[PDB]
Design an enzyme around this catalytic site. Structure first.
Site, mmCIF file in Angstrom:
data_model
loop_
_atom_site.group_PDB
_atom_site.id
_atom_site.type_symbol
_atom_site.label_atom_id
_atom_site.label_comp_id
_atom_site.label_asym_id
_atom_site.label_seq_id
_atom_site.Cartn_x
_atom_site.Cartn_y
_atom_site.Cartn_z
ATOM 1 N N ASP A 82 0.822 -1.215 0.000
ATOM 2 C CA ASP A 82 0.000 0.000 0.000
ATOM 3 C C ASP A 82 0.867 1.280 0.000
ATOM 4 O OD1 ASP A 82 -2.905 1.075 0.328
ATOM 5 O OD2 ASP A 82 -1.807 2.003 1.976
ATOM 6 N N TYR A 132 -1.289 11.202 2.734
ATOM 7 C CA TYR A 132 -2.146 11.605 1.599
ATOM 8 C C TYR A 132 -2.121 13.102 1.353
ATOM 9 C CZ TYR A 132 -4.784 7.157 2.113
ATOM 10 O OH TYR A 132 -5.156 5.847 2.173
ATOM 11 N N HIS A 134 -7.532 -6.217 -0.637
ATOM 12 C CA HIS A 134 -6.524 -5.187 -0.375
ATOM 13 C C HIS A 134 -5.529 -5.510 0.749
ATOM 14 C CE1 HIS A 134 -4.472 -1.445 -0.032
ATOM 15 N NE2 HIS A 134 -4.749 -1.461 1.278
HETATM 16 O O1 I5T Z 1 0.894 7.451 -4.490
HETATM 17 C C1 I5T Z 1 0.238 6.422 -4.350
HETATM 18 C C2 I5T Z 1 -0.033 5.756 -3.014
HETATM 19 C C3 I5T Z 1 -1.357 4.996 -2.977
HETATM 20 C C4 I5T Z 1 -1.238 4.053 -1.784
HETATM 21 C C5 I5T Z 1 -2.530 3.304 -1.525
HETATM 22 N N1 I5T Z 1 -3.697 4.169 -1.499
HETATM 23 C C6 I5T Z 1 -4.669 4.116 -0.516
HETATM 24 O O2 I5T Z 1 -5.446 5.041 -0.319
HETATM 25 N N2 I5T Z 1 -4.724 2.996 0.290
HETATM 26 C C7 I5T Z 1 -6.027 2.569 0.616
HETATM 27 C C8 I5T Z 1 -6.436 1.179 0.932
HETATM 28 C C9 I5T Z 1 -6.470 2.227 1.998
HETATM 29 C C10 I5T Z 1 -7.716 2.817 2.494
HETATM 30 C C11 I5T Z 1 -8.027 2.774 3.838
HETATM 31 C C12 I5T Z 1 -9.198 3.332 4.311
HETATM 32 C C13 I5T Z 1 -10.079 3.954 3.455
HETATM 33 C C14 I5T Z 1 -9.796 4.014 2.108
HETATM 34 C C15 I5T Z 1 -8.623 3.441 1.663
HETATM 35 C C16 I5T Z 1 -3.833 5.154 -2.555
HETATM 36 C C17 I5T Z 1 -2.553 5.943 -2.798
HETATM 37 O O3 I5T Z 1 -1.559 4.131 -4.132
HETATM 38 C C18 I5T Z 1 -1.168 4.651 -5.372
HETATM 39 C C19 I5T Z 1 -1.669 4.018 -6.490
HETATM 40 C C20 I5T Z 1 -1.307 4.467 -7.745
HETATM 41 C C21 I5T Z 1 -0.469 5.558 -7.902
HETATM 42 C C22 I5T Z 1 0.028 6.209 -6.789
HETATM 43 C C23 I5T Z 1 -0.324 5.741 -5.535
#
Ligand code: I5T
Ligand code: I5T
Lengths: 546, 546
Positions: free
Chosen positions: B334, B465, B523
């Site tokens: 992640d 974020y 996930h």
């Molecule tokens: O620069 C990044 C980092 C990133 C990491 C993962 N991510 C994320 O929000 N994780 C959610 C599962 C968690 C979650 C937890 C709680 C609620 C919602 C979500 C999005 C951003 O992924 C990418 C993907 C592609 C490009 C860049 C990136």
């Protein structure tokens, strides 16, 4: 007035200069003069090398672009490169050959010790070669010794562009007048000079250092042998393992490779190994410097029985279990040296190798009580004084700074008269209230021991001496055994408690035993003679402990 | 009523039995039947083997005494041993060949999971052979899974003497009636039986296990594939490194060998790698499982800028510097997977190899703001909701048990509708107040995350974020680069945030990229499919990361 020194890496802090191999390759392969050095600088500020140095591309991406520039250079010079010519091969060898310029590092170290801010300013690349670790190790060793490391590929700027110099001054928080800049490339010297900085053109180290000491007014050339690198407690990785419900062991950890577990004596700390930790990690080992049970950040339960060798050794085995280590090399000093011989006797499968500083291996006498045995030697009188719980604790805890200042001193500084300890009343009865500072330690180093001992005091440490009978009965179970794993015994000439002669019969129980000896060395072996302890241990580790 | 199971090591928990090689050597060398097995038991309770098993002597001391007994046995049998016959050679091979009996360990594991106290009771020696580590590793792997390990050479007692059995019962704190005892040697079974203990004679594992499940009433044979070994937080080595005045990083450490740095995602912990830590350490690696900045025992400064990739990566480099590691293999999931691709791009010299679970490597679009880019994909709507400081923190911190129970669930358990997050008001607006427990986690495991998040909350994690613009500008400096160090991309079929297709163009920037794929995986990759994550990572580590 100067307060900052800046050094280049290639040709200054590291030799032979990687740049000098392009000419070496030309001479060795009878190629036209400056053919390879030309292909290197092809395109100038728009060329592949500048893009590499600014970090736009990696070294592995640059290798083929350099090869293409070598071909275009030969087209004009009307020549042809050999059959199996490799740019990768040339640079792999050049980078591997480049080692630290030890006298230049000593100078930077001395300038920093005198209050100077130091920095490495270098034109470098992002190394993704399969052999990149060699350079990574070099950078790691060098960088720790400086306040800043400014790498061109990281800052996207390069020498001789004037922006990297204003960047340098901003990071230094100093005006050019307060800054010495040392470089082997005159073109890269020019912007620092035309800004007001003192500059040194580095050809041979000696002359560069003569120039450096003249401008700083600090002696850097022909200076005495410096002490090995020490440890700043707050810069260390601190580890904590619970070995049982009430017992947690603390350790300091540095390095990679085979695990080396360091075990201090009485009344010490993990910090007693401060000069060995960076040296052993640099030699290719994973150092685990313990706070032994009863000390520092380790648990100190009050019960006497908690400090008998059987439980101490069983807990050290649990420590290995919990860290996922099938073995470790065990190196001990004083009471730690005794634990280390017992680890080897009772748990040989968990001990890669065993080494002891000062402490000999002497088997238990089944025909004599350990109390009788201790009374036979008048030097061990203080041990009888340590028996009664609360008595020695009171005297040792009364004034901590006095306790360590009186204890930690060289053979020629003796302030303690250890004969008739119980008769005279105590350890410090004929001792000054305000002892002088020993040449072995700084006031700061004494205050670290003081601060550590403020947590649990001397009860736990003194309990190590309070299981003579339990230890004797346990030790008797090993009387039919021999120590056949790799072993090292290091004697200290002037240790009057643990005299070298007490170790004379050790080859009867350890036939393959290797030895080391330190002349003009007192009881506090590690801080008394750090350079030689390191030399002896590294040599033995590399030969017997993989 | 049973509540304790005791197992032998040789022929029970480990196969092939070391005892069975004496007969194998007789058959292979056409020696008279029982010649070598006789030399082994020569003298009986007074013989060299009994002294070895009781711990009076070591294995290296016993080797020559066994050789002498082999000579005396051949004198009576009127025969002669071969030219280069070696007892050492026979036992070295026998010990190396002896591996864990996996179905027997699974049974012991299942009995312990159902509330049984388990113990290994064995007749063993003190191993000082140069190859002793193989056995040490075996004992380490086995012992962790049991309440007690009773070794004959440590307790100075032996099977079949009746004192070791009364010792066994005393350590177990149980009457014989409550104890099952499994052994391959009938003579060693007899005293346990004649004391009242249930006994099983182990020949083939299957029958022994049929007998074991009949007497315990617990299914042990043909049972489903168990989960990999997990971590008990209090049994781990905990490490702490200060990377800068206000920032300390915490990590869990297990194993020896090449350093493997594990980097979790949002909103996680070092504990998210609980199923990988024992497995990777067992595979021959030194695991460093991080609490990423903003989480658990690591520092969580409030400033948004403290969580931009440039500073996070620079701090991870400092972490390596302070631990004395020139490199580590970086494995991320992640947000950790994203940090791990940037470590490879900006610090290739410090990264031995790079692996990512779910997170693809996607270069920055210089012709598009990261805000525009995020608005282009409706699945990333929640990220806009995470932008305003304090808003998401309030909802995520309101009820911690609800937060993790709602988040940590398999692909077929989805309780969160992540479209129109900001429009609907929040993350948990159409979610139950008391979510059910996912099949992936126990209530105990949820409460560990709850307890960890009670220290700093969601500000630091959510700040990861909040640097989209800073990260974009930094990432743009790497647009001319390629990832050329060893890399692994692991996709999860049912991850609806980090879909496998988002990784399709990765070989354009990483041409040597290796891949892994996990079907029916959501996930939370590590806890969803632990067995396969471990299989994929160990296979890649052994092939590409040394
Ligand atoms: O620069 C990044 C980092 C990133 C990491 C993962 N991510 C994320 O929000 N994780 C959610 C599962 C968690 C979650 C937890 C709680 C609620 C919602 C979500 C999005 C951003 O992924 C990418 C993907 C592609 C490009 C860049 C990136
Ligand atoms: O079983 C042991 C362990 C032992 C360890 C070292 N030791 C000791 O007292 N250390 C003093 C220097 C410290 C000190 C500090 C303050 C005051 C006085 C002394 C004596 C006992 O050395 C042995 C030697 C031979 C045999 C067995 C043993």
């Amino acid at each position: 007035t100067l307060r900052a020194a800046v050094f280049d890496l290639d040709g200054v802090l590291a030799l032979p200069a990687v740049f000098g191999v392009l000419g070496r390759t030309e001479e060795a392969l009878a190629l036209p003069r400056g053919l390879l050095n030309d292909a290197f600088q092809k395109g100038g500020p728009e060329g592949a090398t500048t893009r590499l140095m600014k970090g736009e591309i990696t070294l592995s991406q640059w290798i083929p672009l350099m090869e293409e520039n070598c071909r275009k250079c030969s087209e004009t010079a009307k020549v042809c490169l050999p059959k199996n010519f490799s740019i990768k091969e040339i640079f792999d060898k050049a980078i591997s050959a480049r080692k630290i310029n030890r006298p230049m590092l000593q100078a930077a170290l001395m300038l920093r010790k005198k209050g100077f801010t130091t920095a490495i300013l270098t034109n470098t690349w992002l190394d993704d070669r399969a052999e990149r670790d060699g350079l990574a190790q070099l950078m790691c060793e060098l960088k720790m010794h400086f306040d800043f490391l400014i790498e061109s590929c990281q800052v996207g700027m390069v020498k001789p562009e004037p922006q990297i110099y204003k960047f340098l001054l901003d990071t230094l928080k100093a005006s050019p007048s307060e800054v010495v800049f040392l470089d082997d490339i005159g073109a890269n010297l020019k912007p620092a000079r035309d800004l007001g900085m003192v500059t040194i053109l580095v050809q041979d180290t000696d002359t560069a250092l003569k120039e450096l000491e003249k401008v700083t007014g600090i002696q850097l050339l022909n200076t005495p042998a410096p002490l090995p690198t020490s440890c700043n407690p707050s810069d260390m990785s601190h580890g904590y393992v619970t070995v049982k419900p009430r017992v947690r062991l603390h350790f300091v950890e540095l390095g990679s490779g085979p695990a080396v577990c360091l075990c201090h004596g009485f009344p010490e700390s993990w910090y007693s190994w401060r000069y060995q930790i960076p040296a052993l990690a640099q030699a290719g080992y994973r150092v685990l410097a313990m706070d032994m049970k009863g000390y520092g950040e380790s648990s100190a339960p009050p019960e006497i029985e908690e400090y008998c060798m059987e439980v101490l050794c069983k807990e050290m085995v649990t420590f290995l279990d919990k860290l996922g280590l099938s073995q470790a090399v065990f190196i001990g000093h004083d009471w730690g040296g005794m634990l280390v011989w017992y680890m080897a006797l009772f748990y040989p499968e968990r001990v890669r190798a065993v080494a002891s500083l000062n402490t000999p291996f002497i088997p238990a006498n089944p025909n004599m009580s350990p109390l009788e045995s201790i009374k036979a030697n008048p030097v061990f009188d203080y041990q009888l004084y340590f028996q009664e719980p609360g008595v020695a604790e009171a005297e040792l805890e009364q004034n901590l700074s006095r306790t360590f200042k009186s204890l930690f001193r060289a053979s020629d500084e003796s302030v303690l008269s250890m004969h008739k300890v119980c008769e005279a009343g105590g350890l410090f009865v004929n001792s000054p209230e305000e002892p002088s500072l020993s040449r072995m330690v700084t006031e700061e180093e004494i205050q670290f021991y003081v601060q550590q001992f403020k947590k649990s005091g001397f009860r736990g440490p003194l309990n190590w001496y309070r299981n003579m009978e339990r230890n004797w009965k346990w030790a008797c179970k090993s009387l039919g055994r021999k120590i056949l794993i790799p072993a090292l015994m290091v004697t200290a000439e002037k240790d009057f408690v643990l005299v070298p002669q007490m170790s004379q019969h050790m080859e009867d129980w350890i036939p393959h035993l290797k030895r080391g000896h330190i002349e003009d060395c007192g009881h506090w072996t590690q801080m008394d003679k750090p350079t030689e302890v390191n030399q002896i241990l590294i040599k033995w580790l590399d030969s017997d402990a993989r």
